[PDB]
Structure formats: structure tokens, C-alpha cells
């Protein structure tokens, strides 16, 4: 059997006593809010900061709503971190991520510009990513509204959200914004197509994020399975940025991280791979329920100071 | 027109104009130094260290020479830096890597022990294997002649000594020394064999490692291509240790580089792949006369310190 | 302090911050080696020419090899440059000097051939003498080997190979060959012993040839103090041929050269002593790395058009 | 027993049958008037010039007359020669050196300004000095009159201008003109005290300057033993310009331009020595009484142009 820490066996337990619906048992709104209410409980709290702001940009079909985080009112130039958060491009927003947010840029003392893009099935593929991308060119053009100046940006996100942090990487270097990508930290993302990966199978049930799952929100989203923009990995990596990819040793979408670290290598590229143990999907939002994957989390922050110099 | 640092590339035509005979065409007495003389005149000088000892060891074949560097007249447990010489199992010593291995010293604050293994053609494959499994194990065990204990190994060397790098940890985690392999750092290692290889067509003339040279080390080691000890891409790469994997973009090893980093991710183990840009293999042995790469050495430094933690 | 040339001074910053064993500490082939690489990479590239070949003459000892230069495939009868090496008796060989001969040919458009003569410590003064003069008497009597017809022949020579150029002209003043020595070029050579002189005590280290270098070469080699053929200051000076004397005013043996002009000056002889200001011994190797030092060979070479008339 | 040139020993041999009177016997025009006499029957024709034309400048005592020669009538900026004659600071004029004028300004293609200078006894010691100097500063300063622009002065002078010709290196040497010596070319000059040499005794009588008429010349120009501007081996040589120095085998006054070749050497200064085999003083200026002194002529012209670049 795969190891499990005890305290993520311990929650998966406790998921499969309760015996829930899957997704395509729910309605849309009753998923979005099972999971605002699965992070609600499982995630550790918000860090208190000193800035904690929405803001608005325009995008290719009307504003974009984004959340600023900064433990600084005021700071010198340096990155800021473009944050697209998870949810299979279906659900989760700005308020799923929150505590995670609060707590990157509590630790990395850098500004992170949460990203409220449109989801799907209402706006199917590639509405997401015609938004994610919008807003982190906007942020990297520093704007006045912003509030502080970008020498770079650092694209980031969880799942879904790490399919966004490479596609954007991928559009910003065809297409430059005014300063450059100088890091991206694809967080157990769908790179590659998952059907026909052995870890798909290996973990297709009770490892929190599930095949059905997964089909759910395939079908949703709706993506064109030969358009870069939705599985990254047919991209051009010949330029990409510094990477940090985290996977997760249990995650049934793993070897699509694995393609895609390897992928970079293949090309010559800087990455650092790191494969956490024993635990699935999500960790990132977990950190109170699975108290051990906050130093998941740790490990992923001190890559990203490394990698930055 | 691969892309070459400027003072990358005045070094390159320094090589040139000197025009030498071939390793081949030498004796070996003057091929070994010629590479003495080449590293004596392009890296920087050694630094001043509290401590730079000469010790010796068992091995299988008679006592194997250690020089043990430290920045510290005393220290407590910790890990203990295990570094094996480049020069294609033929050539190299315990000077010719001198310099490098202070600052390996001065900038981890981690004792380092450096291992006189047995050169081919006089002791072939697997000699220098045997000895520098012989010398980690022995470190390892925390010997009083030490005078450091350790609580864990880091394998670390460049080009050969990145063979042997690997070649240890796998050893070593088939049977356990007295501490374990902490974090392995092979530097432009050969891993893969190299004949074939996209790189080795593209860098065979021109780059300070030739294809000619390859070619001497190769005849006069004899490595069995199914062997190992000798190709450590063919081992067992499920529980490898922590690695950082350092290249040279204009390599004609590079690729065997590449190909083992993407082994790594394959079977989800940690790495740090460093593509260093627009300069060759030897860059570590190389930081006076073409004083970027030193910046080169300092990005691996701050690699191992990240992945120690 | 003495005077020196700012791109002179930056090369002796260069050593400096090299800090290097002496010839004396390292092996014999490190010493040789040393030296290969410091005038390999400080020399400028070899000048390309329709004549490099290498061939062999008989000597007392066995064979002497030989390096033929020529611009010219094909020339007809003139003089001949018959060129000796520097490096103590000691070290260098065809190829260390290869790049200034090809450099002396291009420029004076006449052939050179230079002398591979047997080296200290294992062939000990008066060798290196016995293999000059052997090769310079074969090539003054038209060898069809050499396929130039020599109507004169021009011995030059750097450092030690200064003192057999002195030698040389002396040996075949007294026995002649089958043509006359027209010209003589000793370019800082040793003439008189340097022991006691104030220029070895001003310039005994940091100018390129150190006084511990002239006593390893001087153990080595084993000169009579008492013999010309070791210090041809002593010899006969009355007939000496029409002489270039070039030194350097930084060179601790710059006196002894100083001290051979004069004594042709006192002896009636025709002499054109240039001593290049700010510059060290070894300057005719170091053009690419001093380029200032093209400029001081160029001086040599019109001096040497001049007085062939 | 010295060796002599047939040419030159017929000349010697015409001269002690012609048995005319020393220079004591004769009255001091009768003297000034056998020389002009001499250069007239023994040296070659004037060459036909373009310029040859009367100046004069200020001097310390009043005008100095001056006289211009030069091939062309314009001319781009250059150096220019300045020539001081023969006779023992007591005889000679602008006619006496005439013809060799015109052949080093024919020979050089650069323009040649000979000094009329006072002389003794009528003038002691050290007016030829005052008036050198002054001439040699006023072409110097590129004053109308001259008709071209001189980017630097070449001193140049036979015997007694010899002598000159170094005082003036000296004095512009302490002293600058507006433009500095570039060359100076003291031919068989008179720098240390002839008396006790060995040239001097070997060569006291026939060989056209005599023991004796050095003891008139001195006589009457009494100049100061101690006196470098009397006699210039005594003065600074440490920035001596670029010299040729010329002199003759069978010169009475021989060593005293042996000697200073040797001051220069011994200063590492740069020199050409050039000691005219088989011929006697004068030499410069009996080239058609002795026609291979043209050839002695013409090797001093090659070393100028090889010493000018
Ligand atoms: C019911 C909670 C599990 C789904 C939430 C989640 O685990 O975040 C994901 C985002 C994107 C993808 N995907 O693109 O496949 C999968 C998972
Ligand atoms: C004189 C040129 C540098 C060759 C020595 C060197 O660069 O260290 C190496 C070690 C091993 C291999 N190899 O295994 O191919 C290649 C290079
Ligand atoms: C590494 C610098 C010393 C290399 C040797 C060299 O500089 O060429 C010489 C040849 C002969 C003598 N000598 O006769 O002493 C000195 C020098
Ligand atoms: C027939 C007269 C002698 C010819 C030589 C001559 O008159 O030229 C000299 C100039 C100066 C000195 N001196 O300074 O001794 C000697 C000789
Ligand atoms: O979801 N759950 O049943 C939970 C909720 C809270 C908790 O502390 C542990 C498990
Ligand atoms: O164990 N916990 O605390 C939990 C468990 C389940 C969940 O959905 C969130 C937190
Ligand atoms: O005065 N002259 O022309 C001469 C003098 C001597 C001589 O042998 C020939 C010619
Ligand atoms: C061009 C080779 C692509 C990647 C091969 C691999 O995944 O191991
Ligand atoms: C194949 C040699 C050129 C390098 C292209 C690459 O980075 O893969
Ligand atoms: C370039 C100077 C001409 C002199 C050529 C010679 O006679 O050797
Ligand atoms: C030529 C006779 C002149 C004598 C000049 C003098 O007494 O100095
Ligand atoms: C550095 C020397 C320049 C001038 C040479 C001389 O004194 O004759
Ligand atoms: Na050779």
C-alpha cells in the first residue's frame, strides 16, 4: 500500500465516514460551497496584515475583481506574486485561497495579487486563462492602483491554478508583459492530460481530489485536449522561467507534474522538483487538519527564496 | 551559434591559440600535468582555513589519501561534505581540486573530505568507485582521525567525480553506511553514456572537455556500458536521496546531465536541475580566468543550503 | 618604483593573485606544464603559413627534431633563422615558442628553423649547446631535406635560448660552417652569470622570471661558471657577426645583457641594444595577454631588416 | 698591422706624399682654409636640392647664420635634422660639410639646418655649445622662417659636432624645446677625454686626424675638463634619446665614442654602434677620395631610418 502520514490518513478517514456526495451529485452552487466549507475547516487561519485589499482590472470580457496581500503598506520594488487558485476551473474564488494567500505573503514578504477569474461551466475554457492572464500583465505593468512597484512578476497557483501559473508563463514569454516572469511555482498542476497516467488510476478514489472529480470538471471547462492554453505541456519550454513544481506523492494528477519538471529539464530549463510525501492534492489548504503539510508548505517558500537570490 | 559568455568565450580563444597536443598524443605523466597546470592558472586561489589536513583510510586495494578542509578548528555533529576530483577517472589529484574545495569549505561552513582514489589506465574500473565508496564510508563512521562527527553524508564532485557522486549514493543506499546520504550534489556528472548524444555532436571540439578526451578517459577506464557502477542512469533511482544536479549548457556531456535529473522526477524524487548558461563543463575549476562562473559555484552553494534545510 | 607599462602591470597582478608553488615545488612536467600554459594561453595565435614541418637532424647525442617555418612554399637561397628556445635549459620546447616563431617568420618573410635540443636535468650543460650548434651547422650546409638553400644563417633565441644563440655564434666564429653567421639576435639573454647584479636583486620576484626560477634552472643544468659555453660574457669577442641585443628593464637579468652589449661595444663590434621599457622578461610570448609586447617584438624585427641590410 | 682598407690606405699614402704642414705651423686662416680644401678635393659632389637657402636666428651673442637644405620645397610636418660640423670647434664652416648636407637631406628626404657657429679661438669654450643650443631650439619652435613644421629635431654631427650633437641631447634633455630630440647621431664624436686612450696612442699620426692637431684644437678651444658640456660622458645619460653612434676603426679618438656607447648601454638607453671597419676619421666627408665611405654613409642613414620608425 502507498504510505500515508498518519495525520492526512487520519483526515482521509474522516472524509470517508462522512460519506459525501460527489460533484456530479451536487448542484453548482452547493459544490462551491462544499468547498469554501471543506477549506473553511481544514485550512489554517489568516495571517493579520498590514494590507489586505480588493482591487478591480479590466479584462477581455469586463472587469476582473483581484485581492491584494502585503504585510507592508508601503514597499521598495522588487516581485510580485500573481496568485490563480485552484477549484478545476469550476469552483473555488478568492475567499477558498485567502488564509493560503495571507500566508505566502506573510512569508515571503512580498505583495500577492489573488486572481478572481471567470469559472466554468458559465465561461468555459479559455475564459480562466484569458483572465489570469489580463491580470498579471496588469500587475506587471505597475499600475498606480497597485500601490507598489513590480520589478518582475512570480506567478503561482494550486491545481487548476498551476495549469495557469505555466499557460501564463508560456503567453507572457511569447508575448513580453513590461517586466518579466522570473519564477513559477506550479503548485500539483495539471501540465499534461491525466487520462492514461498510472497515477491516475493509483489514486483514482480517496486521496481527496478523485477521478469523477476530475471528469467533472473536464467536462465543464471544456478545454481543446491540442490547445497549449489548456494542457501547457504541448507549450514551447525552450525560454521558460525559473520553475518550482511541487506534486504531491499521492495526487492521482502526480505524473502530470512529473511530465512537466521533466519536460524542463529536457529543455535545458532551471527547476526545482519537489515530490511531497505522503500526503494528496490540496495539501496547500489543508494545513490545520494535516497539520504536517504546513511544512509542505514551508518547503515550497524556501525554494521560491532560493530561487529568487 | 550557441549563446557563450564574453569571458567564456575569451578563455575558449586563449585554448585555441595555445593549440596543445591532444591528452592522447601526451604522456600520461605530462596529461595529468597539463590539467595540474590548466587549474593552477585559471581558478581562483585557496582560501585560508582553519583547518586543511592530510589523513589517509582502509581500502580495499591499500590505504586511500583523504584531505580534510574545515573553516572550523572545532566542530559539533553534522553533515560531512564527501568530494571525489573530476578528470575522467585518469587524471586529477588532491591539488588539482585544491582550491575549489576550500571554497566548498569556507562558503557551506561544512567540513569537507577530499579522496586520492585510484586513477586509470594503471588501476581501471572499478577502481576509483571502490575507493571513494571505501573513503564515505569511513567518513561516515565518524572516525576519530576525523576529529568531526558525522551525522550524515553529502556526496559531491564534478565530471567523473559526479559519476562517482551518484554511483556512491546508490551504493550506499543499498547498504547503509554507519549515517545516511543527506543530499548528493553531482556536478556536470556523466550518468548516462554520452556516445549518441544530441550534446556530444554539438560541443565534441571547441568547449574544454572534447570529444577526443572523452574518448582517452573512456579506453583507458573500460567501464562496462551495462555495468552500473559505471552508468548510473541504469540503477535504481526509486529511493535516491536529495539532489542538486548542476550543468553546463555547452557540455558534450550535458545530456547525460539532463537525462538523470528527468530519472530523478520520473520515479518522484527531489531535485534541483541548474542549467548554468553560456559557459562549459570545468566551470567550477575555472573561476579566475573567467571570473562569472564563481557566480556559477555560489548558485549551487545556495541549491545545498536550501535542500538541507 | 620602477616603471611599468599598465597592461604589463595588470598581467603581474594577474601571478600575483595566483600565488603559485615555485618550479622548484612542483614536479618536473608541473614546472614544464606551467609553462606551456602560461605562454598557451598569453601568447597571441599562431600566424598562418604555407610551411610548418617538422623534421630531424643527426646530433652527437642521436637525433635532433627540428621545426621548419616558412611563408614561402618554395624560395630561393638567403639566409636562414636558426631559433633556440628559452626556458632555463630546462623547460619549453617547439611547441611553447611555436606561435612567436610562425610570428618571427610571417613578419621577417625568411624561413626559421627551430632547434628541439635535449634538456636538464636529465641532459645537463653543455647539451643543450652540443644539439644548437649541431642543428644550426646542418642547416648552414643546405640539407636537401630542408629544401632552402641557406646562404647565411641568423641565430636568435629568448632567455637561455639567448645564451646558445651567444654560444652558438662563438662556436661557428671559431670552427665556421659552410656559411657564415650574418646576424645574431640574443633576446634577454644570459651572458654573464646574473648572481650579484643589481637588476636579479631589484627584480628577484614579481617580474615574471623570478631569481628562485634562475637557481632551480641553474641546478639543473649545471653550468661551469668558468666555461664560455655556459657564460659566453667570457668568450672571444673580436669577430663577433653584427648583433641584436634586446633586453627588458624589468628582467633580473636584464644586466647581463647590458654587460654583453658593452662588451662588443669595447671589442669594436657592430650592436644595437634595445631595452624595452616597462616590460618583463618573456615579453616575446606574452603579446595576446600584454598586447603592448607586439609593439616591442615589431622594434626587434626592423632592427633585424636594418642590419641585414 | 690594424687593419686598412686599400681605398683608404692610397688616401693615407697621397696625403703623407703631398707632406703638408701641421695646423700649428699654418696661420689660422691658412688652417681654416687647408680644410676647406681637403672636403673639396676628397668628398663627393654636392647633390642638386630643391632648397638650399641661407637663415640665421638669435643667439646669445648675436645672429647665428644658418643654412637650410631640403629636397622639396613644401613638406607635410616632420622632424628635422640639425647639423653640427667638424673641425675641432676651431675650423670648419657651412661650406666645409656642405656636400654631406646635401646628402643626408637627398638621402633622409627630411630637411637639414647646419649651425655656423662661433669659433676659436677667436670664441672659447663654450660658445659653439651656446650657439648649438640656440640653433637647435629655434628650429625647434617651428618659427616661420624655416619654412616647415618640425614635430621633433634630430642633432646630428662629425668629431667636434659630435661632441655637440650629444651636449645638445643633453641640454634639451634638461631643458625642453618646444619639440623634443627624437634621435641623435653623434658620428665620431668626442666624448670623453681622448687623452690616455688607447685609440689615441695607436693612432696618432697618418691616420688623417692627428695627436697633434687634437692638441691644437684643444688649445684653443679650452674647454673645461670637468665640464660636461666640454666633455658630455660626464653629463646624465639616464634619459638619453634614441643614438646612433658612428665611429672609426683607425680614429684616434675611437674610445672616446666606444665609451660613450657604453654609458648609454649602461643607462639602458637605446643605441645603434656602429664602428666603420678598415677607415679612419673624417670618413663622412672623403667619399669620393675614398669611395667605400660612401657605403660607411649609407649604413648610418638605414640605422636612422630604422631608428625614426
Ligand atoms: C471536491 C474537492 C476536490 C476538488 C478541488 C481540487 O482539488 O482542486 C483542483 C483544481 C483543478 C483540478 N484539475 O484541473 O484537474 C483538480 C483539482
Ligand atoms: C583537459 C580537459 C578537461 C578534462 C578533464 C575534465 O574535464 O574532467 C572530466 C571528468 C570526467 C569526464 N568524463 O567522464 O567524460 C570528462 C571530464
Ligand atoms: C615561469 C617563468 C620562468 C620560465 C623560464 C623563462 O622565463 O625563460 C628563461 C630561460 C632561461 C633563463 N635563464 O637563463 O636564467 C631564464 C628564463
Ligand atoms: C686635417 C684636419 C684634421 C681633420 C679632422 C677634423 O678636423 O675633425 C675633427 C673635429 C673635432 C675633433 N676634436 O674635437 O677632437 C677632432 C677632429
Ligand atoms: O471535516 N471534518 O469532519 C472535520 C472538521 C473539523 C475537525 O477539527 C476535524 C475534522
Ligand atoms: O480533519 N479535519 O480537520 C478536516 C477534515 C475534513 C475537512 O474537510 C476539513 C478539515
Ligand atoms: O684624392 N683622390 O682622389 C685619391 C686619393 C688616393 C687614391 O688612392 C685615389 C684617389
Ligand atoms: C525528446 C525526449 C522527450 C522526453 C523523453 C522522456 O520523457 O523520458
Ligand atoms: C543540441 C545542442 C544545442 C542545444 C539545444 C538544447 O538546449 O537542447
Ligand atoms: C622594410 C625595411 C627594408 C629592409 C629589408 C631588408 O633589407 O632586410
Ligand atoms: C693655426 C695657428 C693658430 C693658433 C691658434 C691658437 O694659438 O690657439
Ligand atoms: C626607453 C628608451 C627610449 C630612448 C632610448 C635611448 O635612451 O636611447
Ligand atoms: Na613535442
Redesign the interface.
Known amino acids: 500500500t502507498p504510505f500515508i502520514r498518519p495525520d492526512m490518513k487520519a483526515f482521509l478517514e474522516a472524509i470517508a465516514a462522512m460519506a459525501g456526495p460527489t460533484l456530479a451529485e451536487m448542484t453548482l452552487e452547493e459544490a462551491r460551497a462544499s468547498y469554501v466549507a471543506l477549506h473553511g475547516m481544514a485550512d489554517r487561519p489568516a495571517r493579520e496584515l498590514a494590507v489586505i485589499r480588493n482591487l478591480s482590472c479590466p479584462g477581455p470580457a469586463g472587469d476582473i475583481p483581484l485581492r491584494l496581500y502585503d504585510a507592508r503598506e508601503s514597499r521598495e520594488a522588487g516581485p510580485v506574486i500573481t496568485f490563480y487558485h485552484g477549484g478545476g476551473f469550476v469552483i473555488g474564488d478568492l475567499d477558498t485561497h485567502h488564509n493560503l494567500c495571507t500566508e505566502i505573503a506573510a512569508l515571503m514578504d512580498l505583495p500577492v495579487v489573488a486572481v478572481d477569474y471567470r469559472l466554468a461551466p458559465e465561461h468555459p475554457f479559455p475564459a480562466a486563462i484569458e483572465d489570469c492572464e489580463a491580470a498579471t500583465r496588469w500587475v506587471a505593468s505597475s499600475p498606480s492602483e497597485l500601490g507598489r512597484t513590480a520589478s518582475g512578476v512570480i506567478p503561482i497557483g494550486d491545481s487548476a491554478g498551476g495549469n495557469a501559473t505555466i499557460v501564463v508563463s508560456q503567453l507572457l514569454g511569447a508575448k513580453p508583459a513590461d517586466v518579466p516572469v522570473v519564477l513559477q511555482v506550479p503548485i500539483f498542476p495539471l501540465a499534461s492530460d491525466a487520462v492514461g497516467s498510472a497515477s491516475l488510476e493509483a489514486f483514482a478514489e480517496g486521496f481527496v481530489l478523485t477521478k469523477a472529480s476530475i471528469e467533472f470538471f473536464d467536462t465543464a471547462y471544456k478545454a481543446d485536449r491540442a490547445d497549449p492554453r489548456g494542457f501547457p505541456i504541448l507549450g514551447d519550454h525552450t525560454a521558460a522561467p525559473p520553475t518550482i513544481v511541487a506534486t504531491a506523492?499521492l495526487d492521482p494528477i502526480?505524473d502530470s507534474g512529473?511530465d512537466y519538471?521533466?519536460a524542463?529539464?529536457?529543455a535545458?530549463?532551471?527547476?526545482?522538483?519537489?515530490?511531497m510525501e505522503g500526503v494528496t492534492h490540496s495539501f496547500t489548504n489543508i494545513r490545520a487538519a494535516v497539520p504536517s503539510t504546513q511544512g509542505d508548505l514551508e518547503?515550497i517558500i524556501?525554494?521560491m527564496?532560493?530561487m529568487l537570490?
Open positions: 506523492s502526480r512529473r519538471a521533466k524542463l529539464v529536457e535545458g530549463r532551471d527547476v526545482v522538483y519537489l515530490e518547503r524556501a525554494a527564496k532560493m537570490g
